Design a protein around this ligand. Structure first.
Ligand SMILES: OC[C@H]1O[C@H](O[C@H]2[C@H](O)[C@@H](O)[C@H](OCCCCCCC3CCCCC3)O[C@@H]2CO)[C@H](O)[C@@H](O)[C@@H]1O
Ligand SMILES: *[B]([O])([O])[C][N]C(=O)[C]([C]C1=[C][C]=C([O])[C]=[C]1)[N]C(=O)N1[C][C]N([C][C])C(=O)C1=O
Length: 265
């Protein structure tokens, strides 16, 4: 494979789309590779990690419990809700809702949790509280995936998302137990985690949350590293490409391959 930046450029050319990417040391926050890192991209379902960061902050403060059971109704549901559809009779705990939102990308689970943090406006306020002055959530699932060309709604930048993820996972803004919980939810991703492991060389750690939207929008936020360690945050977003889902997946994988072959920097 090419060097990381060369592969990122190739991916843009082949996709006829914009790619945004950051590679950041998790421990120190050092930025290693950056491409369009200050440009806006739809978050899509990658927002679900930040959402559950906000939930955990409420838990730490004693304003929420992961055990608390929410008994929601069918009228609360939106599409792509494989876990929450199973529990109209019996409900789900707040912790189960975060697990479903992150590991299964469950949209109704996400919307239920979003309401508990004050909706899109409340999550945006939480982001400002942790010093992210760029990321914004404006809509609910599933409209937040619309990815209209030039629309700033529901966007982040690779740089802001990476910094925000590092803050949530490591800065001690969250309790130790909450930091550990957020990480484990990403480790447990069922949408892409197992597939990614199936193509990673032996020894490479992965934890992740993916997202998909309209007009080619697709993304991943991840922890990756050799020696079975979460060494780096890697954030990749695609937008405004007519390419197939299969190619979008392959292009993101190709950027990963370039990172893997050229890790020491
Ligand atoms: O010499 C380096 C490695 O080269 C190949 O590994 C290949 C692997 O066979 C392939 O499946 C993967 O595809 C890339 C898969 C990437 C997975 C998704 C990446 C995510 C992770 C973080 C967020 C962005 C994307 O590339 C590597 C590097 O060429 C060999 O198979 C392996 O034995 C060897 O250790
Ligand atoms: B997450 O925010 O990435 C979850 N993403 C979704 O639920 C997407 C999945 C999807 C992507 C692309 C296409 O063409 C369909 C579904 N949902 C989504 O983008 N759309 C947008 C809004 N639309 C309303 C008519 C949906 O129902 C929908 O699910």
């Amino acid at each position: 494979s090419p060097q990381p930046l060369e592969q990122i450029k190739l991916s843009e050319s082949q996709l006829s789309g914009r790619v945004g990417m950051i590679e950041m040391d998790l421990a120190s926050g050092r930025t290693l590779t950056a491409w369009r890192a200050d440009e806006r991209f739809p978050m899509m379902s990658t927002f679900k990690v930040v959402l559950c960061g906000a939930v955990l902050a409420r838990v730490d403060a004693g304003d929420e419990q992961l055990e608390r059971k929410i008994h929601y109704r069918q009228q609360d549901l939106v599409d792509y809700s494989p876990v929450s559809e199973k529990h109209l009779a019996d409900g789900m705990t707040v912790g189960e809702l975060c697990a479903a939102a992150i590991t299964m990308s469950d949209n109704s689970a996400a919307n239920l949790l979003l309401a508990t943090v004050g909706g899109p406006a409340g999550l945006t306020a939480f982001l400002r509280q942790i010093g992210d002055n760029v990321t914004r959530l404006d809509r609910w699932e599933t409209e937040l995936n619309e990815a209209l060309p030039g629309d700033a709604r529901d966007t982040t930048t690779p740089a802001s998302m990476a910094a925000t993820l590092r803050k949530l996972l490591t800065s001690q803004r969250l309790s130790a137990r909450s930091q550990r919980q957020l990480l484990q939810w990403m480790v447990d991703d069922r949408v892409a985690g197992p597939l990614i492991r199936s193509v990673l060389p032996a020894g490479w750690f992965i934890a992740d949350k993916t997202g998909a939207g309209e007009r080619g929008a697709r993304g991943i936020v991840a922890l990756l590293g050799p020696n079975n360690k979460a060494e780096r945050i890697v954030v990749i977003y695609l937008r405004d490409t007519p390419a197939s889902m299969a190619e979008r997946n392959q292009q993101i994988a190709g950027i990963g391959a370039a990172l893997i072959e050229h890790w020491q920097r």
